[PDB]
Amino acid sequence: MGPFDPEEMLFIFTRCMEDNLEDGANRLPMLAKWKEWINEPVDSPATQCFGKCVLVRTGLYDPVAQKFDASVIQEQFKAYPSLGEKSKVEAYANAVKQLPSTNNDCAAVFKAYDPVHKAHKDTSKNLFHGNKELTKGLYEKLGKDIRQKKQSYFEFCENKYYPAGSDKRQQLCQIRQYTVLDDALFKEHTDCVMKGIRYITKDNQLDVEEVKRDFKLVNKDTKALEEVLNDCKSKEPSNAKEKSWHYYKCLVESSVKDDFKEAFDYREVRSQIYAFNLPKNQAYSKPAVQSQVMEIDGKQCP
């Protein structure tokens, strides 16, 4: 599933923190440390599960094989030669290669990896887009071609496919009101969005749990959603290019369309700042998101 670009690593780090940070007194202290690649407190289940989360999402720990996988490191270095020195990347990969088979529980995985993390902190940090200076440089080089920090993922895709100043821009008026278009350009755009919020995997597969995650975040039950998605999947088209559009269309035209639009609107807001829930997990309120999304509507469709 690697190599990973800066946005992909940002998604992984922030999602893992969102799912693993304690609530209450220790949250802010923990966050401050984890952000700096200080995986402490080492004795905390939250730190241990955070560590496991990152390792699993990157592929550095394979819970099926119950083994660490150093090939992720070499793939990352191959994609980003500027982010490592060969000898040091090799030393890091070697340390991972020589880790023993490890059980798939947070404590076991964290304990096995922690010595490697400490012995190869800078090497791993640089390679996996944790170096602020190096990452800033990559974002600047990439510019409009990658989702930027503090930019809505929806905005990123919209600008890519319906650029400002172009004769295409006007289509955003309908698009942002959940009008399902039929053309190649819209299918490409919808692919960009659906993959960007992880409803569709890099591997072009539906991720029902990600859709469910967003429903739960707007306080909706997911039984109907699962039934809808099950029906949608039995109608999945052969053309891989069309898959994201297929599920978007199916959801928008379905018996859960209102809940879907509510969940998708909130996701848009949260996609604008990946650390949305990190300092404190924010309670959801429908009217506040209503306001924000309407403001974005008037920005993209003036």
Ligand X SMILES: NC[C@@H](O)c1ccc(O)c(O)c1
- φ/ψ of residue 119, rounded to 5: -75, -20
Among 4, 50, 80, 248, binds Br ion (CB under 5 A): 80
- The H or E element containing residue 62 is strand 61-62
**Interacting residue ranges for ligand X, rule: CB under 6 A:** 154, 158, 175-176, 178, 189-190, 193, 264-265, 268, 293
Task: Pick between residue 34 and residue 199 the one whose CB is nearest to Br ion.
Answer: 34
Q: Give me the least distance between CB of 252 and ligand X, in Å please.
A: 8
Residue 222 beta carbon to ligand X: minimum distance, rounded to whole angstroms: 20
* Closer Cβ to Br ion, 31 or 224, answer by number: 31
Give the CB-nearest residue to ligand X.
Answer: 176
Q: 């992984």: which residue's tokens?
A: 12
Cis peptide before 3 (omega within 30 of 0): yes
For residue 255, state whether it binds Br ion (rule: CB under 5 A). no
Is 26 one of the binding residues for Br ion (CB under 5 A)?
A: yes
Tokens of 202: 């890099």
Q: Between 69 and 214, whose beta carbon lies closer to ligand X?
A: 214
Tokens of 175: 């698009």
Amino acid identity, position 236: E
Nearer to ligand X, 178 or 284 (CB): 178
Q: Amino acid identity, residue 161?
A: Y
Listed residue (191, 194, 155) closest to 176, CA to CA: 155
Q: Are 55 and 61 in contact (CB under 8 A)?
A: yes
Task: Kindly state the smallest distance separating residue 83's Cβ from Br ion, in Å.
Answer: 6
119-143 burial, b at 16+ Cβ within 10 Å, e below that, comes to ebeebbbbbbbbbeebbeebbeeee
CB of 200 to ligand X, least distance (A): 13
The answer to whether 82 contacts Br ion (rule: CB under 5 A) is: yes
Position of minimal CB gap to Br ion: 82
- Partner from Br ion, ligand X, none contacting 193, C-beta within 5 to 8 A by type: ligand X
29 binds Br ion (CB under 5 A): yes
